[PDB]
């Protein structure tokens, strides 16, 4: 049971941060669904890398280059 829209989506094709609010995506990379109120573009969350520590960051992406998994 889940009372939230916190799902996971997989990247279909390779994309880049075309906008200052969008992030770079790569085919095969799965991100966390944050905003899905826009069939056009969807807001996903990715992880960073530094000092052997994986951080977290949000970013918008084209819904035309993504596919929900769960």
Curated annotation (Swiss-Prot):
Subcellular location: Cytoplasm, Cytoskeleton; Cytoplasm, Cell cortex
SH3 domain span: 4-70
Subunit structure: Like erythrocyte spectrin, the spectrin-like proteins are capable of forming dimers which can further associate to tetramers. Interacts with ACP1.
Similarity section: Belongs to the spectrin family.
Biological role stated in the UniProt entry: Morphologically, spectrin-like proteins appear to be related to spectrin, showing a flexible rod-like structure. They can bind actin but seem to differ in their calmodulin-binding activity. In nonerythroid tissues, spectrins, in association with some other proteins, may play an important role in membrane organization.
Protein name (record): Spectrin alpha chain, non-erythrocytic 1
